[PDB]
Amino acid sequence: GSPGENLKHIITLGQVIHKRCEEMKYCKKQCRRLGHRVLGLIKPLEMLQDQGKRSVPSEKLTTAMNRFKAALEEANGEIEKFSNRSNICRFLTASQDKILFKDVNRKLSDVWKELSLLLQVEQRMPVSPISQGASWAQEDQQDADEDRRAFQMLRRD
């Protein structure tokens, strides 16, 4: 357990995600949308810490922060390990889906789904559109098919 700092840890985790991605120069180009969007979710999250509770965080709240932590580490963990051209080529070749944050985008919805419900029920604010569905990954596949053509140039040498 490590409250207080954890609050900011979440934001930073989601922020760097966008930096690490943009820093990369691979198929992640299309996935960049994820790292850029993830920032919109943490944006309002700050409102919670801003309140300045100055005490132990709510169980329900922490429960979402503890699980959400994976959404970040995982998101960046993908591109991080796939940073190596040889490491990314292995996946694309050993996988049909040309997406990095394929599952990351799905799981994220599961976590955000709760966080949002708590924000709309407590903060009573118009939380981002979390109720999307499988369509979320659908669009990712559409572009993933295109990028596949670009990755080709990387194959040869």
DSSP summary, beta strand count? 0
**What multimeric state do the chains show?**
monomer
Helical run tally: 6
SSE-based structural type? mainly alpha
Give the DSSP E fraction (strand runs of 2 or more residues).
Answer: under 5%
The end-to-end distance, rounded to whole angstroms, is 49 Å
Major pleated sheet: none
SSE series? HHHHHH
Number of domains: 1
Shape: elongated
Estimated radius of gyration: 17 Å
In helices, the fraction of residues equals over 70%
Characteristics:
Mixed lineage kinase domain-like protein; 0% strand; 157 residues
Question: Can you offer a commentary on this structure?
Answer:
- The protein has helices at residues 5-23, 28-50, 59-81, 85-93, 102-123, 135-155.
- It is mainly α and 157 residues long.
- It contains six helices and no strands.
- 75% of the residues lie in helices and 0% in strands.
- The chain has one domain (1-157).
- The radius of gyration is 17 Å and the shape is elongated.
